[PDB]
Structure formats: structure tokens, C-alpha cells
Design a protein around this nucleic acid. Structure first.
Ligand SMILES: [Mg+2]
Ligand SMILES: [Mg+2]
Ligand SMILES: [Mg+2]
Ligand SMILES: [Mg+2]
Ligand SMILES: [Mg+2]
Ligand SMILES: [Mg+2]
Ligand SMILES: [Mg+2]
Ligand SMILES: [Mg+2]
Ligand SMILES: [Mg+2]
Ligand SMILES: [Mg+2]
Ligand SMILES: [Mg+2]
Ligand SMILES: [Mg+2]
Ligand SMILES: [Mg+2]
Ligand SMILES: [Mg+2]
Ligand SMILES: [Mg+2]
Ligand SMILES: [Mg+2]
Ligand SMILES: [Mg+2]
Ligand SMILES: [Mg+2]
Ligand SMILES: [Mg+2]
Ligand SMILES: [Mg+2]
Ligand SMILES: [Mg+2]
Ligand SMILES: [Mg+2]
Ligand SMILES: [Mg+2]
Ligand SMILES: [Mg+2]
Ligand SMILES: [Mg+2]
Ligand SMILES: [Mg+2]
Ligand SMILES: [Mg+2]
Ligand SMILES: [Mg+2]
Ligand SMILES: [Mg+2]
Ligand SMILES: [Mg+2]
Ligand SMILES: [Mg+2]
Ligand SMILES: [Mg+2]
Ligand SMILES: [Mg+2]
Ligand SMILES: [Mg+2]
Ligand SMILES: [Mg+2]
Ligand SMILES: [Mg+2]
Ligand SMILES: [Mg+2]
Ligand SMILES: [Mg+2]
Ligand SMILES: [Mg+2]
Ligand SMILES: [Mg+2]
Ligand SMILES: [Mg+2]
Ligand SMILES: [Mg+2]
Ligand SMILES: [Mg+2]
Ligand SMILES: [Mg+2]
Ligand SMILES: [Mg+2]
Ligand SMILES: [Mg+2]
Ligand SMILES: [Mg+2]
Ligand SMILES: [Zn+2]
Lengths: 159, 56, 205, 104
RNA sequence: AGUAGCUGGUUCCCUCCAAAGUUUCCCUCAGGAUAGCUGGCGCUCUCCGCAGUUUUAUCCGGUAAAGCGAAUGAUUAGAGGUCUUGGGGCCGAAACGAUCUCAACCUAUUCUCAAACUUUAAAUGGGUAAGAAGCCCGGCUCGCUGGUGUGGAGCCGGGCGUGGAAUGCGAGUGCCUAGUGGGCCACUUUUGGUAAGCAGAACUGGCGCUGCGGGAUGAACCGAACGCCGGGUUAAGGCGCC
RNA sequence: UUAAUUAAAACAAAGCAUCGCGAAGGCCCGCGGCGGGUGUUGACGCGAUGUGAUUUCUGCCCAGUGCUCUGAAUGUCAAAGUGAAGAAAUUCAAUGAAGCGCGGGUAAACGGCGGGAGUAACUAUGACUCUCUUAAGGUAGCCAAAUGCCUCGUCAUCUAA
RNA sequence: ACAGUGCCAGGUGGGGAGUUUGACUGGGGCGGUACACCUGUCAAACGGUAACGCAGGUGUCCUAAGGCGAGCUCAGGGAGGACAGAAACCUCCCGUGGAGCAGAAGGGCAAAAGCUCGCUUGAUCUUGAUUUUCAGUACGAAUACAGACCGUGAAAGCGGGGCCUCACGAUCCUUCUGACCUUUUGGGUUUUAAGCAGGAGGUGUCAGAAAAGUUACCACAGGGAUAACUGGCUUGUGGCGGCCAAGCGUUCAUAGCGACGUCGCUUUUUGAUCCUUCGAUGUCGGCUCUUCCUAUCAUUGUGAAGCAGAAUUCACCAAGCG
RNA sequence: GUCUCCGUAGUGUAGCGGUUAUCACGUUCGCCUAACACGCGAAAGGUCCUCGGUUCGAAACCGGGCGGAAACACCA
RNA sequence: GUCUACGGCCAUACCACCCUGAACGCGCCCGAUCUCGUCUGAUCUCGGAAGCUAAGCAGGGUCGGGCCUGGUUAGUACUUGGAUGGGAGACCGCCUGGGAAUACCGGGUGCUGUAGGCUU
């Protein structure tokens, strides 16, 4: 069997990337995290305090508490057949603002502006996204050239 | 006699019979675990809300 | 003494090198990988024939040692002790274990080291012989005999490279004329159009 | 493991940091009139032999050292127990380590 | 009528749903408790919510492969410098004087490698988001923070519905609960072993609990899952005769 | 002698040798007693063991474990009793029966009874020597024996083998 | 005035009584601890994942090796300097860490987490929340806060042990600490006792019985979950047979052999496993008797020899008969 | 094979983390004897089995090798 | 064009050598009374302004090493899902999708925020 040790199996997970050791850039501490934010957890081995447990590396959660150095995150953890909402305390070195919602937030604004710009114009615009449709018909110009004939090459034993 | 030791075989089949439900979400979340100092003031902010009722 | 090589013919286990976790490995049977005129310049032996493996398998250090002797003896007999240069291209790094019986049974059955084997792939070169061009038939016969010391299928293939170099034989000579290749003994050094111009001066002065 | 014979720690009576005398704690002798010892004697009296377990399979080779702190303020004289981790050798007020010295 | 975690038995029909041999604790290993799997009773709503799926964004990773003229470790061969050290000599009066020569050393090369190496780095995969609990305004409360009527949180009123990817589907919730807790097999991956119809794992699917067509025969293979029937057509397999 | 798978080399035996005891005793029975057996007995006896006729002999070891013997000279040592403190429960101290520790004896008590190296004028041996070593270091005898793994030991005899 | 008896107390007491005499486990025992923990790997790029799988560690150590601040920079190497050399001390230069950080390993660290000084006790007092194993219980360990008291620094800050991942222990009992504390039963005072809170004494089989053997005189309930035959899969070992041809055979590889290598067959060897049989399949050998195989010793018919004869050796069809 | 244990001058042997590696025998030198022997006075002589590691320092402590000696191998 | 103080990302910014630097700066530099600290005013601290870009620093250079980024390697290796495909096996091919990394070749060699200077 395996040991129940807290940091077992994190030889590569928590190590620093190649040629990125040493000082922690100070903009890691200048980020502003607010209640209700979405953050990606990524344990950093340089700071051994507030280190999220390995099961939370690479999971994204919601900030519910902010203290002097860490935040409280509500992050889903699956244990057998159930998913629990777990409240962890993680120092702000090990998290980073998620960009997932931005492409949504960027869309929310452009939609509301289009919905307001087209409304005053008495027209109709597309707001919902759509999956890529099958490409429509088109002509391909040969430009007075014959397509290159291709043939399979003979087998040659390159040993 | 020796016997089998461990297996998770057949387990994901049992987990999915009643579905792997995500946690229940309500629009109000409990204030359990939030900073005591911050919460002490939040109670004080709610306590005196009636003061500015007339201005509102 | 040792088990029939059919017991270890297949690459079943992960590579098991002689390291600090595997101690007590006996020395390999093959200790010499080059013989012939190792000191011949790159240009004396333009021909190179390979014995190529058709099978993914393990070759024992005994079969590598046996083939080396088999191939070498026929070359010396037909081209002279200074008319060729052989290079065995496989080193027996994977270690095979033995669970020696006479009783515990299958309890505590992890085995002690027994020997070493080289793990070869399909298309990988087992050994190579470079000599002069009028020894093309002798090279083919030297390698054809060595195949009988190995399990599985091999192919003898005459390379289009120049000797033991990585450059095509047909364009080797011109590259040497343009000083893109500088002989360094058994092989050549490649001169790119890079780095301090001073080197270019020394080559072209 | 060496501990000073004095330390400046929190006194609960004084409610502030105070100097303290540090000594090792020793179990006192067992009273014959503790209710559990009274109950034991009554149960062990008569026939039947032993009536409670007698522990044999000792495994620990050390004990947790308990320091008996005592406020030095004349009026307070409050005492407290303070446990440190296990150690095979414990001394109070040993010689302090010196650095850069020839080891004779 | 001693106890028995152990062996043997346990009596009518139909209808509906339908397992487990796994987690943790146990002087626990032929047994229990425990969660999971099951059934029953419902109830709260519905005619927004959800998903063993994709799509679009966004993170996580160190396996496959690859690398070793990149760090660690392992390893073959030549070549160029060499006095900065040693082995053989060798003129000697003898020295770092001369003469070589083979070693080590350094410099670019070169063959071959890693489950407990790595600069790189897949596929498959794991989180999250895809709106009304949102978006935007005006105001009030604070003992919290504060150059600042700052900051953050809370509360109040108000305006916005093209319900903001595809597909499919009604959901949620609460009590009581039995049996199980010996498993075994196959594709792929995989540890030990010479190997085993051997021992041990991952994923999924099976047999167990399951008939049926085919594989002559057969727990698992291939096809396909079953109310009692008629007609038609198929699957996998077949069409000398049986 | 194992009725009903073992008739024997097992048990017994005479012989031999240890042990306790002079009766308020030794050994033993019994819930109990002015109880009972030996005992209607008295050391040439009774009680407890071992070996096992005769013949010859019965070596060394008391460290271990047992048994036994001496004891206020003297460590520990219960109850009771003595003293002191205290309001008392209680606490403390002193004193110290056997038994243990201390010291002798005892093996026909249970039992035990070594290792290495050199060395004689051919070689082999090694009477002899040095060394480490335990409470003694297996003596007189006897042996591939019902006891010796190696082992179907080696030589001889018995056989054609 | 003791024997003695009655009742207490200490010793002795397998003469006798009751009881126990772990578990895992390629049968059990012996062996080991995979029984409580930690690192790397296995492990198939989230997490999880087994074997008596692999390589290792643990039951400690530290008044500083805890806390803060300041100043410095390490291993190794090059070149110099009296005695001085491979190695003492001084100097300059290069030096991404190739050192050090208690220990196993892995991660982390360069005006620091390392070395040296200075001041110190955040290793203190206190209520909750969280994380890890997980049943989302306990312990242990750990994480953010909050309330006090302090240390340190010029200060921002940092610190409620060790840079991180290990270093540990329920109920009952006992012992210590805390309060102008509660109770101590009709009331009061005082001893005592019991409570309430927090430490310690230990259960290592580490969620925690108080525990030696033998049975061949043996017993019962079971087990083919499990060993001792046969049989089955396997064939390492055993047996038998090919391929290559360095050599042997005076010469000559192959008449006859055949190294180094390598490919098979068989189940007349022994193993490995544990599928059938423990409400029983009678367990060695011999005797008897029949049959079958060929991997042929003889005999029939043949090929080849380093076959003159004779004798022998290799090979073929061959199991009729011995 | 599991487990325990041991290697120290030429021989047998000690070594209470800091020894001028202890003791006896042996060898060498000088005395004594006509000479030898005993005996008296002096001296040399340890690859501490080997590699590596912790340690300020290891013959010792800790693992891995090379030899060596023990106790176990039972129910069938 | 560019510097100084404080920065963000943290080599396109590093390392080696060479050339050039107007003005203001930043430095080198001169001293030790005071503050402060040393074996040593070398460093640290302090008071200065004679001299100099020699060095640091800045910009530029090198068929420069590194770094960054492309190409090639290559639709290759590997891989999801499929077959009563091949093969004694070892393995391999195809179908449906995804798709790397060296050697080799090219290009590039800091951007930028706040505050304050210099530069007709
Ligand atoms: Mg089970
Ligand atoms: Mg394997
Ligand atoms: Mg009593
Ligand atoms: Mg009955
Ligand atoms: Mg049971
Ligand atoms: Mg228990
Ligand atoms: Mg059963
Ligand atoms: Mg990994
Ligand atoms: Mg690989
Ligand atoms: Mg069961
Ligand atoms: Mg299996
Ligand atoms: Mg099985
Ligand atoms: Mg069943
Ligand atoms: Mg089913
Ligand atoms: Mg079916
Ligand atoms: Mg068939
Ligand atoms: Mg029909
Ligand atoms: Mg048919
Ligand atoms: Mg009878
Ligand atoms: Mg006797
Ligand atoms: Mg005695
Ligand atoms: Mg005896
Ligand atoms: Mg004897
Ligand atoms: Mg004798
Ligand atoms: Mg008794
Ligand atoms: Mg008894
Ligand atoms: Mg057992
Ligand atoms: Mg995975
Ligand atoms: Mg510092
Ligand atoms: Mg605080
Ligand atoms: Mg520290
Ligand atoms: Mg009264
Ligand atoms: Mg018996
Ligand atoms: Mg008997
Ligand atoms: Mg059998
Ligand atoms: Mg064989
Ligand atoms: Mg010959
Ligand atoms: Mg069975
Ligand atoms: Mg039967
Ligand atoms: Mg029968
Ligand atoms: Mg029968
Ligand atoms: Mg035949
Ligand atoms: Mg100027
Ligand atoms: Mg100065
Ligand atoms: Mg200049
Ligand atoms: Mg360049
Ligand atoms: Mg710039
Ligand atoms: Zn006090």
C-alpha cells in the first residue's frame, strides 16, 4: 500500500519550472481578490505556507473569504460517487485569477451593447453563439494551371 | 487462505446508478468560516440599518 | 549455467539498468565493441554494411560477444586484420533477474540479477562494418554468418552513408572539398557557416 | 535537551508576561483515599484474585517532560504545567552551546 | 431446548423493482459495524432545472514519444592540444636542457542508455465558465480599513428579457430498509515470475443473477438480451450429405 | 504386562546405594474431632527414591538449578504492638517472625565433562612446546554397537557375486 | 502457661483449580512485519490504485538546530606567499549552488531558508472555522483567522516551534495545575472526599484484552477457502533433438565429434501453482497379468565410415518377436 | 537457503569515540656458561580483512563486498 | 536622442571581448572633525568637490556562446476509438480522429509604468 503522507507524489507538481526558481515576483501579491471571484489553484513549492493539498492542484474555485495573506475558496472535490464543496484556505501565492469567465464577461458586455445599439435602430442582431456551421459552397480558381499529380513513393529501406 | 486485496472495479458503475450529483447551490451562502473581525462589523452594519431609514 | 535464451527473448519488463538501486550485477560478456583498424581515417573505408534487427526483442551479451567474434574472424580471414573496422552498436544495459529455486515458493519472488541484455527495436542497427569498396561481398558474408548467433530475424543492409559518418556517400567528397567536413580520424567534423569568422580564416588560410 | 531554569512567559493570574522558575514535574505519591483507590481495595479484597488488568506490553522508552512553571512575583506564586516533546535525556540549566571552539 | 462467527434444511401462485463481493474500524482474515449498491412509503413542485455527450473559452499535468555534440547517472571509439602531473626509455657532467614515447588531463567530436534521470512534450484525460442568484444605476449602515465621502461589505429603491452554445430529458426532496461485504473472466495498459488455466493492479464490458442464434462440444468468445403468437427481414455465421 | 492389533529389549526381581524419622516423631488419609493408616509397629523398623543377579569397576565438576546447614553478626520484611504531630480521621518514625538475600556442605541430587598453532635428520604422525580458555574440560572402558550424519566408512573374513 | 486450638497477618505451595497461550502469510511452522507512520517508484501526464512489489527511513534530535534583526556567501577550481609538502594560514580571481540547511529521500532556498554576531522565549494564554486520512468519525499533524500578553526591528513587518512532506496514543483509574468555584444530603465551621477545566503516567497487535507449553492418548464443528497422491496448465530444472561452424580428427570444419551462440520437443525427473477431491478416490516397493509407445539393445532389409577381413561406429524403413 | 556471529604484529589473543593499538609466546641484539638451556638488560615488528558513509576525530559506530564458524530445514 | 529615483514582466534583458559617450546626471574620486564601524576610513558611516570617463553605467559591434522565436525533423514517433485484419509468436498493417522532440537552417537581441532632469 501507499503512505498517507500529505505531500506524497508531488515531486514534479510542486517543483518550480525550469530556470524560474528564486524570488517570487511581487505582482503575485499585488493582485486583488474579492469575494465571489473565480481563481485557479496551483501550488507553488517556493512558499511552504498555505500550500493547497495536492488534490486541489489544478482545480478552480470561488473566493468566499479574504484575510491578510490567504483567501477562502469553495472548490468542488469528487470523493467516490459524490462531489463535495470544500472550503480551503490558500495563500495568495498559490492562486491566480481565472480567465474562464472573462470570455463570458466580455460577451455579456458586447451583447448588452449590441442589444441596446440595435434596439434604438429597430433591427435584429445575433447574440447567441453557434457551433461552426458546415462550410458553404465556393468556387476554386485553377488559374490556368493543372493540379499537381501526386503518386505514392517507392519503398526504400532507409536503415 | 489468501484473498483479493483491493479494487475499484464496478465502483463507477455503482456511483452512476443514482448519478454523481454536484453540491446543491442556493443564492445565499452561510457566513460560517468568514473572518471574525470582518463579520463583527457586518453585524454592526446591519444593526444600525434602521438609522438611515428616513433618508432612504 | 545460464538459462536458454528463449527465457528472456521478449522485452517484457521495464528497462532495469545497473544503478544504485540494482547492485550486484555481474559484468557483461561483451567488453569490446570496436575491433579491426579503428584508427583508419574516414576516407579509407567508404563502405558500411549494417545488420538491422527486424524484431523488437532482447539480445544477450553472450550473443553480442559471440557474433562479434564470428563476424571478426571471417573479416580477418578475407580482408586482413587491418582491412576493416567493426563496431557493435548495442550495449547490454538492461539487467535480467533470476528467482533461483532448488522452499518459499512464489513468496518473496523478486529475483537476483543474472545477466545483461540489449533492448533492440525494429530497424535498429546491431553491428556495423566499414571497409574498402571491393569488400562488399565479404561484408555481406561476414554479417550473414553473425546472424546465426542471434534470435529472430535480422537484415543485412549496405548503407548509403560514408563509412561510420552521417553524410550520404555520393556527396561526401564534395563536402570535404568545400571544407564543410573536416576529417577527425574515424569520422568527420561538420563546419557550419556560423560562429567567429576567425575559424573560417583558419580553415581557408 | 537542555532548558533554562528561568523563562519569561505568560502568567494566567497576572494576565501578563512574568519571569518564571522552571522545574521538572514529578508525579506525587498515590493517595490511599482516592475514590478509585478505595474502589480498587474493596474489589481486590476477598477471593477471586486479580479483578483489573495489569498492563505488561510496555513499548514507549521515554516520557513527555512536563515543566512546572512558577510565577516569581511574590504575591501571585501561580503555577502551571507545560509539556515539551519526548526526549531520552533532559537537563535543566545545562551549559550553553559555544561556537568556534576546539573540542578537546 | 447448554453455546456454536461453523455444516444441513427452511413448505402456495402470479405481478413489479432488483444487488454485492468494494471503502473505513474491529485479537479483524469462514465474522461483524460502517459507507456504497437495493426495495418500499411517500411528499414538494413542473408540464426553470438537469446530463457517464459534444462545442466554445480557460486553466491543470510530466506519462507515451524524445534528449544525452543539455543538468544527474551510465557508457564505446577515434582525433587535436599538453606540461599542469605520472609510466617507459633515451644523450648525458645534468638541470624544466634535449629526445621521443604511453598514460592520464583539457578541447571539440562520436556509439549506446534510464521505473526510482531530464531541457522538451503528446494523445486520451481532470477542473471551471457559457447570465435574471445576471448587467447597470441612485441612495443608506458600519464599531471594519482610512490622507481622502477612501476601501470593502451589507441593506434599500429602480431600469433592463433576443432565458445569451449544440443535443437530449420533468425534476427535487425525506424517512424506513433487506441482501451483500469469498468473486471470477476478456480487449487495452500493467507488477512479480522461465512460465502457468499462476499471483497482484487500472479502465471498460461481461459471467456471477441470463435465457436465445452462431463458435460441433463449452460460465465469459461473436451476434443479440426474453411477455404468448402469425407474417416479413435480418445479425454473427453459414449453403457437398449429415 | 496393554481383556479385544504390541509378550517384548518394557515391568518386577534378588543384589547395590542414597534419603527421613527415637513417637509431641517420619510418611500419609480426612469437611470435622481426645479423628484415622503404617502400628498387635520401634532403626536387623517403618516410610521415600534410584540402579537392577554374579564378576571387574564406578573417574573429574558444587559454577547453574535443587536440597541442606549457622545465624541478630545483619540488607529487605506483614499484621499486631510502641512512640510523636494533629481537632480527629490520618500521617510519620522507631522496632524487624519466617522467607528471601549473605556464607558453608552436598552429584549412587537434576545434570555437565573445549578450541587453536608449531614441533622428531625422507614423508606421515606428532610423545614434546606455546596460546585462548571454562565449575570440570570425557578418566577406565566401549564402538559405524538397538547409539556414527557423511556412509553401502576403511582393512580382513564369510560368497561366484 | 508452653504443646494445642479459634481468628487475623507474611512466606511457601503445578499437590490441586480455572484460564490463556496474537494476526498477516502463495498450507501451516521457522523466517519477515508488508500490523502505526514517512520519501522516491510502481502508477498507465488530475486525484485514487494491489502483491511477503522495488529502493530507503521512523519511535529520536534541538535554549538553539525556536523567534527577530543585521552583515556576509557556499562546494570546487586557478594563480601566488618564510619554515609549508597532496593537505595548516594569508591574498587575488572564477564560481547558478555543483555547498549547507539534525536525519531517509523528494521538493524548496543566494544582499536567503545557508554561515556569523546581537537581542530574545510566538515552543506562552484563549474560543471557534478549515485541511489532510476519512465514514467526510477520532487521533495525530497541519492551514487561515480572531482575542490577549510579549520578542524583535529604525520600520514595513515577522514570530503563537524546527523551510515542507514523518517523528505518535481513547474510555476507566491515578498524579499535578486553576478559581475568595460547585457539592460533601437536617443546619453551621473545619479537615477529607467528589466535581468542573487543562497537562502527564499507555496501551508499538500503535481506534488501545491482563496471558507459556505439549499431545503419537487425543476430542469436536468445519474446510477441498488449505497442505500431504493422481489428474490438469507451465517446463525453470531434468531428459532428448536441431541450426551456425572456431576447432578436434597427422592432412581434412560436418566419417565420427564439436566451442561460443542460438531454436525446439517431451512430461518416464524435480520444481512452481492450489483448479477437482477432506459426510475419505486405501498411501512405497515387490509378486502376478495384459496391453500400448519409440526416443531401436538384439534380430529382418538397407545407406555411410578415419568399412581390407573380423570387430565396431553413424543413419534409414522398422515396435513383428525377444 | 534463513538467522546469529567472527576477522587486530610471525601464533593465540585484549582494546570503558581521543591508546606511543594490550598480554603471553615468538624473532633480533647484548650479558651469563667452555658451550647450550634457564636466567638478566635492551630492540624491531600491526595494510586493525576490503570499500563507502555519519563524526571535530572511527580499528571501534553505520551499510556493501571477501573469507570463516555456528543453530535451524518440521506434519506428511 | 537619452539619463536619474522607484518599479512591472524577469536573459530579446545574460556572459565574453572591442569601440564610442555631447549636456545634466550617476559614478569614480579627496578627507576622517563630527555620526558610525573596522586588524585596516578597504567595506559601512560621515564631511566634501581638486581631478577623470580609466572603470562601473549607457549605446553600438562579433558569419560571438546563451537566450527568444520560426522552419525542418514530420503528418514522422506516439496516440483515442474499430475489425471473426495478418502473423506460431515478436510484433505489424489498415479504418476513424489527435499529433510530438533532437541534430540541421533562418530571424531577433529587452519592452515598458510613475516622478524628475538634460538635449534649438
Ligand atoms: Mg474480500
Ligand atoms: Mg514483468
Ligand atoms: Mg484476603
Ligand atoms: Mg444440544
Ligand atoms: Mg468465523
Ligand atoms: Mg482490539
Ligand atoms: Mg462455506
Ligand atoms: Mg510519475
Ligand atoms: Mg521513455
Ligand atoms: Mg463470506
Ligand atoms: Mg488474475
Ligand atoms: Mg487464486
Ligand atoms: Mg453466488
Ligand atoms: Mg446485471
Ligand atoms: Mg447474456
Ligand atoms: Mg470449436
Ligand atoms: Mg418470425
Ligand atoms: Mg452448419
Ligand atoms: Mg492386546
Ligand atoms: Mg540416584
Ligand atoms: Mg550447589
Ligand atoms: Mg538433559
Ligand atoms: Mg554427553
Ligand atoms: Mg577416549
Ligand atoms: Mg501449584
Ligand atoms: Mg492447571
Ligand atoms: Mg494464522
Ligand atoms: Mg491516469
Ligand atoms: Mg538576513
Ligand atoms: Mg495574534
Ligand atoms: Mg530555522
Ligand atoms: Mg450533623
Ligand atoms: Mg507427533
Ligand atoms: Mg509419545
Ligand atoms: Mg500431487
Ligand atoms: Mg533444458
Ligand atoms: Mg585441425
Ligand atoms: Mg482448490
Ligand atoms: Mg467424495
Ligand atoms: Mg476404489
Ligand atoms: Mg470408498
Ligand atoms: Mg523410428
Ligand atoms: Mg563631458
Ligand atoms: Mg577613503
Ligand atoms: Mg571608455
Ligand atoms: Mg548567435
Ligand atoms: Mg534598452
Ligand atoms: Zn503571576
Amino acid at each position: 500500500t501507499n503512505t498517507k503522507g500529505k505531500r506524497r507524489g508531488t515531486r514534479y507538481m510542486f517543483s518550480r519550472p525550469f530556470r524560474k526558481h528564486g524570488v517570487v515576483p511581487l505582482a503575485t501579491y499585488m493582485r486583488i481578490y474579492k469575494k465571489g471571484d473565480i481563481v485557479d489553484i496551483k501550488g507553488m513549492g517556493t512558499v511552504q505556507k498555505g500550500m493547497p493539498h495536492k488534490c486541489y492542484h489544478g482545480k478552480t474555485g470561488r473566493v468566499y473569504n479574504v484575510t491578510q495573506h490567504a483567501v477562502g475558496i469553495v472548490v468542488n472535490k469528487q470523493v467516490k460517487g459524490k462531489i463535495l464543496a470544500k472550503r480551503i484556505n490558500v495563500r495568495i501565492e498559490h492562486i491566480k485569477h481565472s480567465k474562464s469567465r472573462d470570455s463570458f464577461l466580455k460577451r455579456v458586455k458586447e451583447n448588452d451593447q449590441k442589444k441596446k445599439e440595435a434596439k434604438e435602430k429597430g433591427t435584429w442582431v445575433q447574440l447567441k453563439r453557434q457551433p461552426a456551421p458546415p462550410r458553404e459552397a465556393h468556387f476554386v480558381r485553377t488559374n490556368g494551371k493543372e493540379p499537381e499529380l501526386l503518386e505514392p513513393i517507392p519503398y526504400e529501406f532507409m536503415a | 487462505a489468501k484473498s483479493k486485496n483491493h479494487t475499484t472495479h464496478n465502483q463507477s458503475r455503482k456511483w452512476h446508478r443514482n448519478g454523481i450529483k454536484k453540491p446543491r447551490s442556493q443564492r445565499y451562502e452561510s457566513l460560517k468560516g468568514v473572518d471574525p473581525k470582518f463579520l463583527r462589523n457586518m453585524r454592526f452594519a446591519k444593526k444600525h440599518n434602521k438609522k438611515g431609514l428616513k433618508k432612504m | 549455467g545460464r538459462r536458454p535464451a528463449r527465457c528472456y527473448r521478449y522485452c517484457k519488463n521495464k528497462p532495469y539498468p545497473k544503478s544504485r538501486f540494482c547492485r550486484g550485477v555481474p559484468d557483461a560478456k561483451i567488453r569490446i565493441f570496436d575491433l579491426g583498424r579503428k584508427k583508419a581515417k574516414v576516407d579509407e573505408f567508404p563502405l558500411c554494411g549494417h545488420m538491422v534487427s527486424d524484431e523488437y526483442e532482447q539480445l544477450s551479451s553472450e550473443a553480442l560477444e559471440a557474433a562479434r567474434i564470428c563476424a571478426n574472424k571471417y573479416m580477418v580471414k578475407s580482408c586482413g586484420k587491418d582491412g576493416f573496422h567493426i563496431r557493435v552498436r548495442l550495449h547490454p544495459f538492461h539487467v535480467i533477474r533470476i528467482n533461483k529455486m532448488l522452499q518459499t515458493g512464489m513468496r518473496g519472488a523478486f529475483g537476483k540479477p543474472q545477466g545483461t541484455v540489449a533492448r533492440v527495436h525494429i530497424g535498429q542497427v546491431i553491428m556495423s562494418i566499414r571497409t574498402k569498396l571491393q569488400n562488399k561481398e565479404h561484408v555481406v558474408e561476414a554479417l550473414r554468418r553473425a546472424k546465426f548467433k542471434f534470435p529472430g530475424r535480422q537484415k543485412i543492409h549496405i548503407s548509403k552513408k560514408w563509412g561510420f559518418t552521417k553524410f550520404n556517400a555520393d556527396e561526401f567528397e564534395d563536402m570535404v572539398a568545400e571544407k564543410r567536413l573536416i576529417p577527425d580520424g574515424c569520422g568527420v567534423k561538420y563546419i557550419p557557416n556560423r560562429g567567429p569568422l576567425d575559424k573560417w580564416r583558419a580553415l581557408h588560410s | 535537551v537542555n532548558v533554562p531554569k528561568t523563562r519569561r512567559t505568560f502568567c494566567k493570574k497576572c494576565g501578563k508576561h512574568q519571569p518564571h522558575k522552571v522545574t521538572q514535574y514529578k508525579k506525587g505519591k498515590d493517595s490511599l483515599y482516592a475514590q478509585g483507590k478505595r474502589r480498587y481495595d474493596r474489589k481486590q479484597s476477598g477471593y477471586g484474585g486479580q479483578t483489573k488488568p495489569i498492563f505488561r506490553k510496555k513499548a514507549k522508552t521515554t516520557k513527555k517532560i512536563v515543566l512546572r512553571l512558577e510565577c516569581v512575583e511574590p504575591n501571585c506564586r501561580s503555577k502551571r504545567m507545560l509539556a515539551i516533546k519526548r526526549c531520552k535525556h533532559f537537563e535543566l540549566g545545562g551549559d550553553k552551546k559555544r561556537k568556534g571552539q576546539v573540542i578537546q
